[PDB]
Amino acid sequence: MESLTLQPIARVDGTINLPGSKSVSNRALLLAALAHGKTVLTNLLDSDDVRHMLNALTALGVSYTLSADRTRCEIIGNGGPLHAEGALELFLGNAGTAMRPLAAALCLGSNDIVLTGEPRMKERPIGHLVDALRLGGAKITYLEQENYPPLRLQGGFTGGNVDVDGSVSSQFLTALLMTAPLAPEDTVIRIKGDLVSKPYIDITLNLMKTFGVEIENQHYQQFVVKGGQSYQSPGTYLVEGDASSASYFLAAAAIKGGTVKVTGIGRNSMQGDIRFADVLEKMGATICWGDDYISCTRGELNAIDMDMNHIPDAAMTIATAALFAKGTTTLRNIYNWRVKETDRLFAMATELRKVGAEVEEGHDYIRITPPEKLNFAEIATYNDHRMAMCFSLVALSDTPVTILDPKCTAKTFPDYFEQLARISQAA
Ligand SMILES: O=C(O)C1=C[C@@H](O)[C@@H](O)[C@H](O)C1
């Protein structure tokens, strides 16, 4: 068991050029692979989740090249649905943005492919997506537990009237949206009831439009898709910096700045997590917006009580920032935290108590009352990059913190600790 101990950070100040967005990177790679023409992606993220997507594309026969730092990628588009037979197994780690999108995309035409991943991935739900794909004609088999990967995909998705549940994950709808335009028949995707974390659907539609495809969005209740379409290379495409990765640095300034500026995202970004800056502002920090930057300057930090379903990933950063705020913070409507890299409600509550907080783990919310002073703890990270990054903020106090398995940050941000250190000042 590897570990990293962070010594107390007296002040943070500086500029961070953000790594590329994981959400955008994996969507852009799949669309580039399906598209006609060569796509040159710049500022692509190099992390575990993107490497699993690249490996899957290689296994499916897609040709591409990567620059030395793996942030520039020239993809030779396949000009249509990807194919493989022989129950070829694609190992997708714990990458939801590879597993859900490929589960749908590979249902086009004929195929015989198996999608699997790490143990936790076999415990992350995919049943609602499989139900929708089957309504459209896909043949899918659960090889282990019903409603979870691994899946054996044998193709057959032709389109038609498909219902999909959007109450557990927005990724199921994202996967259907990217796939449907290439189906031979027109598709009408009806959302059964509620739709969680809607901003990710906006990211998906933005990327599809960049690749030449638009659909009819009827108030996020129904999506009308014309079949027989083709994705087209946009030529050169710049991947936005990651707004979720940015949260740690902006929060660091709200707690211990100084001013921290992150570049690569700005007011025009398509990522919902830029709204994390609004939460810091509501807590008392000062935010500055640019076309290609967002900065946060220390003001004060007061507890908040808010629905965080629109920014589930960045919301975890508020849970550790709450350790430094005045009053009790409550984050609500985050049941979805339970079905991600780990059950984040359980994990966050457990680790927060270790540093002294009084925490109520609600079924779908978390209430955090900070201690007068934090104490040292060895933080368990649950193979979850965000647990490591969120708890790194504990060091913006008088106590060091030890983070177990620090390399788990590589899922989305291999250089996280170096970057935090870049803005860490002793004076
Ligand atoms: O579609 C996406 O890119 C994502 C959607 C949400 O489930 C997030 O929680 C997940 O980390 C990424």
Side-chain angles (χ1 to χ4, degrees):
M1 180 60 88
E2 289 179 354
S3 72
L4 173 170
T5 296
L6 293 172
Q7 296 187 202
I9 298 167
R11 197 171 194 264
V12 292
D13 192 278
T15 300
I16 293 298
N17 303 310
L18 297 169
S21 165
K22 176 248 287 171
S23 294
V24 175
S25 289
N26 272 356
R27 280 164 174 77
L29 282 168
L30 178 49
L31 296 176
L34 292 167
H36 290 71
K38 177 173 63 64
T39 296
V40 172
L41 298 178
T42 61
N43 204 225
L44 186 70
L45 172 62
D46 175 23
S47 74
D48 301 338
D49 283 358
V50 180
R51 185 185 282 274
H52 290 305
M53 174 65 82
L54 290 163
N55 286 164
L57 297 177
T58 293
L60 290 166
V62 178
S63 289
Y64 64 76
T65 65
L66 286 164
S67 65
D69 69 9
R70 297 172 66 86
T71 67
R72 184 173 186 282
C73 186
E74 302 180 310
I75 302 93
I76 303 299
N78 192 53
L82 308 186
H83 292 289
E85 308 83 53
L88 173 62
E89 181 185 281
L90 303 182
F91 186 86
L92 302 182
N94 198 18
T97 64
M99 177 66 75
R100 279 66 174 272
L102 290 170
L106 298 173
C107 286
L108 291 163
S110 297
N111 265 333
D112 187 355
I113 294 162
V114 166
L115 302 188
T116 189
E118 294 167 358
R120 173 62 179 172
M121 178 55 77
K122 300 182 177 182
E123 296 172 313
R124 289 176 64 190
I126 200 156
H128 294 161
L129 174 53
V130 169
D131 292 339
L133 292 165
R134 283 167 172 171
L135 287 174
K139 171 58 190 293
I140 296 166
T141 302
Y142 291 110
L143 297 175
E144 288 186 54
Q145 190 155 58
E146 190 81 359
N147 305 315
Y148 302 87
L151 305 180
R152 184 167 180 187
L153 311 171
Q154 290 179 287
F157 185 90
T158 54
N161 294 293
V162 315
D163 295 327
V164 66
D165 191 327
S167 74
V168 167
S169 169
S170 65
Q171 293 181 41
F172 306 150
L173 176 62
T174 278
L176 289 165
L177 288 167
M178 292 190 293
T179 292
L182 274 40
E185 300 311 312
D186 291 348
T187 306
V188 173
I189 301 165
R190 194 291 297 296
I191 307 306
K192 293 184 176 185
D194 300 323
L195 177 58
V196 292
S197 310
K198 295 184 182 62
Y200 289 98
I201 300 306
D202 291 341
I203 292 181
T204 299
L205 295 171
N206 183 306
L207 270 289
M208 288 167 57
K209 187 179 180 175
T210 285
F211 284 83
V213 175
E214 293 186 75
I215 52 81
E216 188 185 335
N217 179 358
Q218 311 186 324
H219 300 85
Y220 300 87
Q221 297 276 65
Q222 183 159 283
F223 301 75
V224 178
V225 189
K226 304 181 205 286
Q229 301 192 63
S230 303
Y231 284 113
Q232 301 297 335
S233 167
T236 49
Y237 179 76
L238 174 69
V239 173
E240 292 187 359
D242 199 298
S244 306
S245 298
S247 71
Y248 308 106
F249 307 124
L250 294 175
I255 296 160
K256 216 69 175 183
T259 298
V260 174
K261 175 186 278 182
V262 295
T263 67
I265 56 180
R267 65 267 200 108
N268 317 295
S269 163
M270 71 179 91
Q271 293 167 73
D273 277 9
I274 61 172
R275 295 273 80 79
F276 171 82
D278 302 352
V279 183
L280 290 181
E281 187 174 75
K282 291 181 179 174
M283 292 176 86
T286 299
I287 299 297
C288 289
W289 296 86
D291 215 76
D292 197 39
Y293 75 80
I294 301 174
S295 76
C296 178
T297 297
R298 170 65 175 177
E300 56 190 75
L301 212 59
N302 302 297
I304 51 85
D305 177 341
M306 285 178 73
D307 180 321
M308 300 296 268
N309 67 302
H310 60 296
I311 49 167
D313 293 355
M316 300 174 63
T317 306
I318 300 296
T320 51
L323 293 172
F324 301 92
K326 184 179 181 184
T328 295
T329 287
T330 302
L331 309 181
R332 303 174 190 283
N333 199 15
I334 47 175
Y335 167 77
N336 55 342
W337 274 20
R338 300 196 180 273
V339 304
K340 296 179 182 295
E341 281 81 334
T342 189
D343 173 335
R344 292 163 159 177
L345 273 174
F346 174 72
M348 181 64 70
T350 301
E351 305 308 304
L352 285 172
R353 294 177 184 121
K354 285 165 53 174
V355 296
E358 179 189 310
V359 184
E360 172 182 352
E361 181 197 331
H363 176 63
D364 59 4
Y365 67 85
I366 189 171
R367 180 168 283 271
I368 303 158
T369 299
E372 185 180 319
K373 66 171 174 53
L374 298 162
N375 59 263
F376 172 84
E378 181 174 79
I379 304 297
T381 50
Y382 306 75
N383 298 308
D384 181 359
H385 54 142
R386 297 203 191 288
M387 284 297 294
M389 299 184 285
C390 286
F391 281 80
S392 70
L393 303 186
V394 168
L396 299 167
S397 69
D398 296 324
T399 180
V401 63
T402 290
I403 307 292
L404 256 20
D405 189 27
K407 286 186 165 43
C408 72
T409 63
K411 191 170 187 285
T412 60
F413 201 164
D415 298 342
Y416 179 74
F417 289 105
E418 130 82 50
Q419 291 294 282
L420 174 64
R422 177 188 302 260
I423 57 171
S424 293
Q425 313 299 337

